[PDB]
Amino acid sequence: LCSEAALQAIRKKMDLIDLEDETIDAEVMNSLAVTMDDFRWALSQSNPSALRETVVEVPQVTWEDIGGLEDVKRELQELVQYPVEHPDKFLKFGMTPSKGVLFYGPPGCGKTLLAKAIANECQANFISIKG
Amino acid sequence: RPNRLIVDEAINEDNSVVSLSQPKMDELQLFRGDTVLLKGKKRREAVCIVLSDDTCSDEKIRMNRVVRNNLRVRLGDVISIQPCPDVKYGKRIHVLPIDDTVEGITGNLFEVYLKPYFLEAYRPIRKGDIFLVRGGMRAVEFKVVETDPSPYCIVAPDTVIHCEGEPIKREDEEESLNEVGYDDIGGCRKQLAQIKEMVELPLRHPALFKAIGVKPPRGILLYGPPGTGKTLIARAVANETGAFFFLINGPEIMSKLAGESESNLRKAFEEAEKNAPAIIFIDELDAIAPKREKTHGEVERRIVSQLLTLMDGLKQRAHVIVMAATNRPNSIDPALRRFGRFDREVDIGIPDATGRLEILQIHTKNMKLADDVDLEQVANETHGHVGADLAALCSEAALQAIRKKMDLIDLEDETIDAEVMNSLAVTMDDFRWALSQSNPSALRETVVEVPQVTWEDIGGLEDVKRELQELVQYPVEHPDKFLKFGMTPSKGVLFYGPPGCGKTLLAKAIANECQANFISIKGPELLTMWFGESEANVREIFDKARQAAPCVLFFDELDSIAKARGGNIGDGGGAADRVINQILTEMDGMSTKKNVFIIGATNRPDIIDPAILRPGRLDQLIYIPLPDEKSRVAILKANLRKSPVAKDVDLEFLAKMTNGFSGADLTEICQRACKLAIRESIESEIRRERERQTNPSAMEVEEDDPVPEIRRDHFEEAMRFARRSVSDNDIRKYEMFAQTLQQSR
Ligand SMILES: Nc1ncnc2c1ncn2[C@@H]1O[C@H](COP(=O)(O)OP(=O)(O)O)[C@@H](O)[C@H]1O
Ligand SMILES: Nc1ncnc2c1ncn2[C@@H]1O[C@H](COP(=O)(O)OP(=O)(O)O)[C@@H](O)[C@H]1O
Ligand SMILES: Nc1ncnc2c1ncn2[C@@H]1O[C@H](COP(=O)(O)OP(=O)(O)O)[C@@H](O)[C@H]1O
């Protein structure tokens, strides 16, 4: 992408200069600088190769994005953050914390946003599998 | 120096015209038609006549193939012009044909070729010039050997043309004015432009890439149906840029014995390496590098690995560009697609109606088709043909037209006469006869092309038209106002209403208005990949839609899966849900960079799965109501375009009396009336022909055939045999669902 973006900016300053004459002394290109328009054009005719692949990343949704649900906020914090940050303290009591939770409610109430935010605070990955 | 310009191809096919720009002509104090002297490389000069142009820039000069060959230059070079308006009228000109063009012609060439060419044109010529003339069935090149006064002269009605003597030997400076080039390709403007750009960059000035330090492409993959002209594209590019085109044939390599195949391939690459900037063409790539599972032997693996190693062995040196041709771009070994190997893919699709017309125009340039044929009709009735088929059609038409003249050339001689060629013409009957016994090869292929339906074809439906214009045209025609300010455009629209009201017409109309490609997937095929076949087909359907962006993907009868699902089978519901899973999975995978629009049509809105009805998918609902108002009159005009008349059967009364009817019913009425008119005309013709058998030519007053003159009685009789297809229950069901949609959510 970067290479062809440079090539296009060379193109837009090739015909008007005397390319027919003795070769350019690499100073016109020194005067040449790329622009965001060239990058957009290069992005236009690009062929990505990843596409159908599971993506692993840290979602960027913060708890300010969601409103209310202070109860589920606290419950999810208790479920997830305590074992990872306080393993020795559970080991003192010697209990295995539960690993699992279920969300059920009316459609479109922020379950996906809740999962994204709770993964955001723990600074963890997020593998999503859909129906 | 405001003299030098840049050479580019011209649009006018005359041999003595060069197109400048009006400002440049004005600066050089030259007027229309003034003779000019053009001087190019190798110290060759020629004389020509300038004209005006529409959109040519100041630094570009347009000229055809003959003038470029005479000046001994190529595309993208520069020339120095000079106005020299002191041409003196010539007296005697000696012109001779070339050896390898007149094999078996004899006759007197002056009365056939030269006289029509040199009349009322005043073509300037210069000593040593070479020009090409189209004749009976061949293109003959003539070389001027001497003139008087030397070296400039103008052919005038009073000249002494000498055209006698032996043909002269072809020299070794001009390659030829007969091989392939950019003027021998039609219907592939966009792809040819892409390839031309991408290959003109490295093959002209390698030193610029050396100094800049960027990576030129090292492989180009062309794929398409066989016989669409890929080898021809590569040959044209190689012969125009200037290279050492070196073809490699797949079957030829596979036909060797064991260990010599890879050795031959290695000599091929090393030879192309040490013969200057060259293009290597590999034909039938899938024949030598198929998928790994297809291969069963061991020599195939060795050949594939050898090809891969030699491909990876290219690092800079001479800029050698590798091109390969394959039928369908999935049988190739997936290993041959990583970066540094074949990576850039260009699609060569089947030509549309304009492409077929252009191919026919190209192939019949030598012939002398009579002034009665209509190439537009032959072009637009031959859908499903490729370039090779059209070339074969033209050849067969010529052969048929020349067959019925054997009496004139009975025996004759081994060298056919000349005037007999000019006595030959090809008529529409010959073309139709060649059409009849011809079988195309595309047939079962998805068709992508811009539909021709316009806005006036549809009567009424103003609100739907406005809504489609807002939803489709705005996000694309002014993408700046959408990238500024964060609006997320919708990805789909779902149509629902009574059957036969014109959903397909609206989709085609908006596709035409947006000037975007149209792909239609109909119910029968959709159920074909439902049961029996698999769901892998949707993958390449979406891939092809992505390739030709922008596009308007159309899914017709989306409820067919549910209609077949509900019954007494209960076995294939899994197949229907796989269809929906595929549709959803590649529907959500689309990105906003590309403009792909998905439109679905259905007539049972309450049976569709609610998964599709969701943000991020097909979410807007548009209800097309049952027709009313004198927009059905516009409907009647739409299919009465070609139908001649209606006299005095007021269509407005019909619109008033025919309320509650869809478009299909009205079109049926029009077709029935036309059928009655045809029946009446044929029975009248038969009556006349059986009447003429008694009285021989007893007709004092001359009547031609009855002109199509549809009366009121035909239409009334047709109207008597008419009913309404859509009952009153379906419209009430639709309005009930509309009210439920309005209130429940
Ligand atoms: N705090 C929130 N609570 C509920 N819905 C929200 C909130 N913030 C945003 N939304 C909106 O709700 C919509 C549906 O949320 P989502 O979690 O995907 O639904 P579901 O949990 O049913 O899959 C999203 O498009 C989002 O824009
Ligand atoms: N504009 C055109 N587009 C496609 N085919 C053309 C065109 N002009 C001529 N042809 C014919 O198509 C043939 C191209 O060869 P083709 O069989 O397509 O090569 P390949 O076997 O590599 O596909 C030529 O014989 C030529 O006569
Ligand atoms: N404005 C219009 N309203 C209704 N029908 C029309 C209109 N314009 C044309 N038609 C007719 O309607 C027919 C379109 O039918 P079509 O949409 O293919 O059926 P379906 O609605 O089942 O897909 C065409 O034959 C056309 O002649």
Residue by residue, DSSP assigns B217-282 as: ---EEEE-STTSSHHHHHHHHHHHHT---EEEEHHHHHTS-TTHHHHHHHHHHHHHHTSSS-EEEE
Ligand 1 pocket residues where CB is under 6 Å: A 66-67, 107-113
Q: Kindly report the length of chain A.
A: 131
Q: Is B50 helix (H, G, I), strand (E, B) or coil?
A: strand
Cα B509 to Cα B450, B490, B506, B512, distances in angstroms: 10, 19, 5, 5
Q: Which residues of A touch B335 (CB under 8 A)?
A: none
CA-proximal residue: ligand 3, atom 16 (nearest): B502
Longest alpha-carbon distance in chain B: 96
B582 contacts: CB under 8 Å, gap ≥ 6: B535, B538, B539
CA B147 to chain centre: 44
Distance (angstroms) between ligand 3 centre and the Cα of B598 equals 20
- Nearest C-alpha neighbor of B544 from the set B443, B448, B618: B448
Give, in order, the Cα–Cα distances in Å from A59 to each of A100, A120, A121, A127, B651. 20, 6, 10, 10, 64
Q: Sign (positive/negative) of CA torsion B118, B121, B126, B132?
A: negative
Phi/psi of residue B468, each to 5°? -65, -40
| Ligand 3 close to Cβ of residue B625 (< 6 A) | no
Please check whether residue B731 is in contact with residue B626, taking contact to mean a CB–CB distance below 8 angstroms. Answer: yes
- Which residue has a Cα nearest atom 22 of ligand 1? A108
Q: Is the dihedral of CA A41, A46, A51, A57 positive or negative?
A: negative
Residues of A in contact with B4 (CB under 8 A): 20
B635 lines ligand 3 (CB under 6 A): yes
Beta-carbon contacts of residue B420 (< 8 Å; ≥ 6 apart): B405, B408, B409
> In a mutagenesis test of the A interface, which of B593, B594, B595 is the best target, namely the one with the most A β-carbons within 10 Å?
B593
Angle between helices B260-273 and B299-312 (to 10 degrees): 20
Closest to B46 (Cα-Cα) out of B30, B58, B35? B35
CA distance B188 to B197: 14
Distance separating alpha carbons of residues B305 and B289, to the nearest angstrom: 9
DSSP structural state of residue B558 = T
> Helices in chain A by DSSP H: which ranges?
2-11, 28-31, 36-44, 70-85, 87-93, 111-121
SS3 label, residue B691 = helix
Instruction: Give the span between the Cα atoms of A19 and B78, in whole angstroms.
Output: 10
Q: Which ligand is nearest to the CA of A72?
A: 1
Distances in whole angstroms, Cα of residue A56 to Cα of each of A76, A121, A128, B250: 21, 16, 9, 43
Instruction: Round to whole Å and give the CA distance between B531 and B621.
Output: 29
**Beta strands, E only, B388-546:** 492-496, 517-521
How many other C-beta atoms are found inside a 10 Å radius of the C-beta of residue B668? Answer: 16
- What's the per-residue H, E or C state across B34-45? CEEEEECHHHCE
- d(CA B387, CA B355) in angstroms, rounded, equals 9
Nearest residue to B81 (alpha-carbon basis) of B47, B53, B51: B47
Side-chain-side CA neighbours of B402 within 13 Å: the count stands at: 16
Atom of ligand 2 nearest to the CA of B325: 22
Interface of B with A (CB under 8 A): 4, 6, 59, 77-78, 201, 205, 207-208, 211-212, 214-215, 343-345, 589, 593
Report the run of H or E that residue B152 belongs to, with start and end. Answer: strand B152-154
Kind plus residue range of the DSSP H or E element containing B679: helix B663-691
| Residue that is written with structure tokens 């040490």 in the block | B274
Task: Tell the burial category of B241 from Cβ atoms under 10 Å away from its Cβ (0-12, 13-18, 19+).
Answer: buried
Beta bridge partners of B89: B154
Binary contact (A51, B589; C-beta < 8 A): yes
> Which H helix or E strand runs over B560?
helix B560-565
Cα of B386 vs centre of ligand 2, distance in Å, is 8
Pocket mutation for ligand 2, best pick of B189, B231, B232 (most atoms within 8 Å of C-beta): B232
Q: Do residues B410 and B463 touch, judged by C-beta distance below 8 A?
A: no
Q: B526-530: long-range contacts (C-beta < 8 A, 24 or more apart)?
A: B526/B555, B526/B557, B526/B560, B526/B561, B526/B579, B527/B560, B527/B561, B527/B564, B529/B579, B530/B561, B530/B564, B530/B572, B530/B575, B530/B576, B530/B579
Distance B112 CA to ligand 1 centre (A): 82
As a whole number of angstroms, the distance between CA B33 and CA B435 comes to 44
**CA angle B208-B212-B214, nearest 5°?**
105
Give the 3-state secondary structure percentages of chain B, helix then strand then coil, rounded to 5: 40, 15, 45
Task: Give the orientation angle of helix A111-121 with respect to helix A70-85, to 10 degrees.
Answer: 40
The encoded tokens of residue A9 equal 């900016």
Give the angle B309-B312-B318 at the CA atoms, nearest 5°: 120
8 Å CB contact between B471 and B494 = no
Ligand nearest to the CA of B356: 2
Chain A CB contacts of B207 under 8 Å are: 23
Token pair for residue B87? 């041409």
Q: Which residues in chain A have their CB less than 8 angstroms from residue B205's CB?
A: 19, 23
- What is the enclosing helix (H) or strand (E) of B62? strand B60-62
* 3-state secondary structure (DSSP) of residue B736: helix
- Cβ-contact B363, B333 below 8 angstroms: no
Resolution in A: 3.6
Q: Cβ separation of B593 and A20 shorter than 8 Å?
A: no
Residue at B194: amino acid letter? Q
User: Hey, what are B631's tokens?
Assistant: 């927009």
Distances (CA, A) of B355 to B188, B349, B392, B602: 8, 11, 16, 34
For A60-71, letters b (16+ CB in 10 Å) and e give ebeeeeeeeeee
**Structural method:** cryo-EM
Residue B336 assigned as binding residue: no
Per-position b or e across B452-477, b if 16+ CB within 10 A of its CB: ebeeebbbbbeebbeebeebbeebee
Phi, then psi, of A31 in degrees rounded to 5: -70, -25
Tokens 């959500």 correspond to what residue?
A: B588
Nearest alpha-carbon partner for B236 in B268, B279, B204: B279
The helix/strand count (H/E) of chain B reads as 27, 22
Asked whether B630 lines ligand 3 (CB < 6 A), one says no
Report the nearest-CA residue for atom 8 of ligand 2: B185
Report the separation in Å between the CA atom of B736 and the middle of ligand 3, taken as the mean of its atom positions: 23
Side chain identity, residue B157: P
Q: Distance of CA B34 to CAs B190, B352, B402, B622, Å?
A: 35, 41, 43, 63
Of B101, B172, B112, nearest in space to B142 by CA:
B101
Q: How many CB atoms lie within 10 A of CB B351?
A: 23
Smallest Cβ–Cβ distance between B207 and the set A6, A23, A51 belongs to A23
Q: Which two tokens stand for residue A69?
A: 């649900």
What are the φ and ψ backbone dihedral angles of B586, each rounded to 5 degrees? Answer: -80, -10
- B737/chain A closest Cα distance in angstroms: 22
The H or E element containing residue B46 is: strand B45-51
Ligand nearest to the CA of B557: 3
* Closest chain B residue by Cα to residue A107: B614
Q: What does the DSSP 8-state code read for residue B55?
A: S
Per CB-CB distance under 8 Å, the chain B contacts of A16 are: 59
Cβ–Cβ < 8 Å for B122, B156: yes
Distance, CA of B395 to CA of B363 (rounded, Å): 9
Specify the pairing of strand B60-62 against strand B78-82: unpaired
Tokens, residue B620: 């807007």
Rounded Cα distance between B360 and B357, Å, is: 5
Q: Residue A108 C-alpha to ligand 1 middle, in angstroms? A: 5
C-alpha pair distances (Å), B578 with each of B572, B597, B599 = 10, 22, 20
- B420: enclosing H helix or E strand: helix B419-422
Q: How far is CA B531 from CA B528, B570, B571, B631, in A?
A: 6, 13, 10, 42
| C-alpha B640 to ligand 3 mean position (Å) | 14
CA nearest to B312, candidates B335, B291, B289, B328: B335
Taking CA atoms, what residue in B is nearest to A45?
B594
For residue B36, what are the β-bridge partners? B48
- Residue A15 burial (CB count, 10 A): 12
Whose CA is closest to B468, among B592, B624, B635, B602? Answer: B624
User: What does the alpha-carbon distance between residue B46 and residue B71 come to, in Å, rounded to a whole number?
Assistant: 7
* Residue in A closest to B586 by C-alpha: A52
What CA–CA distance (Å, rounded) separates B735 from B461? Answer: 17
Q: Do B201 and A7 touch (CB under 8 A)?
A: yes
